[PDB]
Design a protein around this ligand. Structure first.
Ligand SMILES: NS(=O)(=O)c1cc2c(cc1Cl)N[C@H]([C@H]1C[C@H]3C=C[C@@H]1C3)NS2(=O)=O
Lengths: 491, 98, 49
């Protein structure tokens, strides 16, 4: 059953079309085959989108797969909601709940709100690009108003190429006026690779700055530039290279010839191509389940003008979309589920931070569950809160009256408490205030030399330091050491 | 449907309104078919040919009025259906005039 | 390698000990913030030059 479909592809989406050609024969042919008529045409001109859509409807196909631009989303929704033709896409998700659209890209916005709330920012800059749309820009301003944030949002996308070396210099020097430190980028990969190079030229990647990339292929762009900088760069991934089928596709993908499939003989892959691959899995699961339920899709006639007045559609496409919304397989993004509208739920997004060795994950974020860090505590050097022993003596070390409600190093008060804070301020270490157990100053035992008290805590390696009323004698210098004396007294 | 029907009718000059969702469809037909279109609707953003528009721009006057009232901190309630060009405009002057 | 590891901000200061100071690349650290001085024996302003 070679079933007629239609495909829309931009002039330059060569990696994506090659991944579609791979996924075409990656799994098929125990059954029905596909008849893809490919349209390597533009996406900006909605008249061209109209011509291609009426051409493929003149063909009379059952389903159309491809991309759309923000100047075409209204046209695609307006034709598909009329003519009941199910349309599937990997592009940016739509704003309104529209029928007959399945969209392969998950949400980013709740993830990005989770990331900002995890880092606990208050004031930042937001460089956005207009031509991807403004839904995230609308979403962050509401929570910025509620969560008392201070956003300086800046449009950057309409800047031409021929002034594109000094516009960024004026832009970041205006950011130097408020002395910005925290930048969220929201662009395509080309604008990211343009803006990272201009940052690394004007010298803004030292320790102190902090960058969040709002894309899905965090490692799909260049990261060898600002890897060794000093700035810290975080982003998101939906394609995790650790997994079994992922690494299988990596080995399958690397061994292909570049000449037959352009952009294929690399290690990594674009997330757009990954979703294009999973789209074939969904689309074949559809016609699989319709032969499971044995429902015939016989058109039984020709199609005609797309301008038919009034045009009348066929509701077996409604049943096609109904069976599309029930597809649940595993793919490169993980599990998939759909809503009542065609939007994706049941996804998982990995949080990816850049380190010196390279990228690494620190946690995941689900469709309902918030940010769960994976407890990756590779911090090998923790400055230990050192052991400070003392004893209760007025006014050297005294209890407070409200010690149960307070905690720890706040509970004690006196001369020695004030002194130890000065020592730790001058020396930069961490400390915890402890008490000697046996309640003594300490002397040695007869015939066994067992120093008890505050002496043996330092002799026997128990306590680390002792700021306390201790008297320099002759018999104490042999086992512990003393500084210069700080307060004189007598019997 | 209406535009294809009237160009099949052989219209010499097209006039009518548009919302935020059909603006690309009409400018994409008119740039190809070279038909003069006239409108009282909201003005566009990019310089498109064959579109005459009677509604004047606003953003310069509104920025001048904010500078005259001498403000620093305010709220801004918007609707999306007329477009978001003014919202994109006032944020840049917010970035400049702090 | 300096411009990769990020040592050309305002504060650092470099002296090139050569004769063709402009014969090498200077578009890299021109906009940095560091200050770079050197020597020339071939002056492009002159007539025969
Ligand atoms: N007047 S006092 O007892 O509180 C007192 C006693 C002393 C102080 C400082 C004070 Cl405020 N520092 C001295 C040190 C300073 C120098 C000279 C000896 C030691 C080094 N030791 S000390 O003689 O023990």
């Amino acid at each position: 059953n070679s079933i007629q479909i239609g495909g829309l592809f931009p002039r330059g989406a060569d990696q994506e079309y090659s991944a579609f050609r791979v996924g075409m024969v990656q799994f098929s042919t125990s059954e029905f085959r596909l008849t893809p008529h490919i349209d390597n045409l533009e996406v900006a001109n909605s008249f061209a989108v109209t011509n291609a859509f009426c051409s493929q409807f003149s063909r009379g196909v059952y389903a159309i797969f491809g991309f759309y631009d923000k100047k075409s989303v209204n046209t695609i929704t307006s034709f598909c909601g009329t003519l009941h033709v199910s349309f599937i896409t990997p592009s940016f998700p739509t704003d309104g709940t529209h029928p007959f659209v399945i969209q392969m890209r998950p949400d980013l916005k709740g993830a990005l709100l989770s990331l900002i709330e995890y880092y606990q920012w208050d004031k930042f800059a937001y460089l956005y690009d207009s031509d991807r749309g403004l839904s995230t820009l609308q979403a962050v301003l509401d929570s910025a108003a509620e969560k008392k944030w201070q956003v300086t949002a800046i449009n950057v996308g309409n800047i031409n190429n021929d002034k594109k070396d000094e516009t960024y210099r004026s832009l970041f020097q205006d950011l130097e006026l408020k002395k910005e430190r925290r930048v969220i980028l929201d662009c395509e990969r080309d604008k990211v690779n343009d803006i990272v190079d201009q940052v690394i030229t004007i010298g803004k990647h030292v320790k102190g700055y902090h960058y969040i990339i709002a894309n899905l292929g965090f490692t799909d762009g260049d990261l060898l530039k600002i890897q060794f900088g000093g700035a810290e760069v975080s982003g998101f991934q939906i394609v995790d290279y650790d997994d079994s089928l992922v690494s299988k596709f990596i080995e399958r993908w690397s061994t292909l010839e570049e000449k037959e499939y352009p952009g294929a003989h690399t290690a990594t892959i674009k997330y757009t191509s990954a979703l294009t691959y999973d789209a074939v899995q969904v689309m074949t699961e559809a016609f699989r389940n319709l032969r499971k339920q044995r429902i015939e899709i016989s058109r039984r006639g020709n199609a005609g003008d797309c301008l038919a007045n009034p045009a009348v559609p066929w509701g077996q496409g409604v049943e096609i979309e109904r069976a599309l919304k029930q597809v649940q397989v595993e793919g490169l993004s993980g599990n998939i589920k759909f809503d009542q509208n065609g939007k994706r739920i049941n996804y998982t997004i990995n949080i990816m931070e850049l380190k010196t060795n390279g990228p690494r994950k620190i946690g995941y974020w689900s469709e309902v569950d918030k940010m769960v860090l994976t407890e990756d505590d590779t911090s090998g050097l923790e400055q230990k809160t050192v052991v400070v022993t003392t004893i209760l003596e007025s006014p050297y070390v005294m209890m407070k009256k409200n010690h149960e409600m307070l905690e720890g190093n706040e509970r004690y008060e006196g001369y020695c408490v004030d002194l130890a804070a000065e020592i730790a301020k001058h020396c930069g270490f961490k400390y915890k205030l402890t008490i000697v157990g046996d309640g003594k100053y300490g002397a040695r035992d007869a015939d066994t030399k067992i120093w008890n008290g505050m002496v043996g805590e330092l002799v026997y390696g128990k306590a680390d330091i002792a700021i306390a009323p201790l008297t320099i004698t002759l018999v104490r210098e042999e086992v512990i050491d003393f500084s210069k004396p700080f307060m004189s007294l007598g019997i």
